[PDB]
């Protein structure tokens, strides 16, 4: 399955995933392509902040879906 991730800079990321993949797994894949660690990642879809621990099928995320990658700040 193929989904997309759009950044604030405008860059569109193309990922190869599975419906059973957790959000944490997806964040790991983003780290593989962008180098940005999962703890600095924040995923948004269908008006909701995707939580670590649930799968793509739990949020019913299917093919050609576009996720929004935003900032996750930890004290600054």
């Amino acid at each position: 399955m193929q989904i997309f991730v759009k950044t604030l800079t405008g860059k569109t990321i193309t990922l190869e995933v599975e419906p059973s993949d957790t959000i944490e797994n997806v964040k790991a894949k983003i780290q593989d392509k962008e180098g940005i660690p999962p703890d600095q990642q924040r995923l948004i879809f269908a008006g909701k902040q995707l939580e670590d621990g649930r799968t793509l099928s739990d949020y019913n995320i299917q093919k050609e879906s576009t996720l929004h990658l935003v900032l996750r700040l930890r004290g600054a």
Binding site: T9, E34, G35, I36, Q40, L71, L73, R74, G75, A76
Partner: protein
């Protein structure tokens, strides 16, 4: 009052900056409002920002010095701890603020931040990534932004 207490603290620090001027730094009231300052920082020699001049705004809260001053860049800069809006991520401006500290110490702490960023807890993750993994690219791009906006 609380406003009155801050006012004399601000004036004291302003006179201390006159007697003992900081190196490559200057600051003072924009107009006649002592709570609103404007500051300049020269690009440190041991940094890719060398040669550029960076302007900052400094606003003193009414509970100063018991609350930290609010500092932000007006000049655009390529930095992992400073975003496009000029917002700064620095401990001394928040959790590690102390009334014993001064504006002079704050400006010096910012100067060090330009020489040695803190990429692990960044404000701009992409820039931090480049700083950590490709220092040459970081330095190259930092100099470019300095040429375009700090000259």
């Amino acid at each position: 009052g609380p406003l009155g207490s801050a006012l004399k603290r601000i004036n004291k620090e302003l006179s201390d900056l006159a007697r003992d001027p900081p190196a490559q730094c200057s600051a003072g009231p924009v107009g006649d409002d002592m709570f609103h300052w404007q500051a300049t920082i020269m690009g440190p020699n041991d940094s890719p920002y060398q040669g550029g001049v960076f302007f900052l705004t400094i606003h003193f809260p009414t509970d100063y010095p018991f609350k930290p001053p609010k500092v932000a860049f007006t000049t655009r800069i390529y930095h992992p701890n400073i975003n496009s809006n000029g917002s700064i991520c620095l401990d001394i401006l928040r959790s590690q603020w102390s009334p014993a500290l001064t504006i002079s110490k704050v400006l010096l702490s910012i100067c060090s931040l330009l020489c040695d960023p803190n990429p692990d807890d960044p404000l701009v993750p992409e820039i931090a990534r480049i700083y950590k993994t490709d220092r040459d690219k970081y330095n190259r791009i930092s100099r470019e932004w300095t040429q375009k906006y700090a000259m």
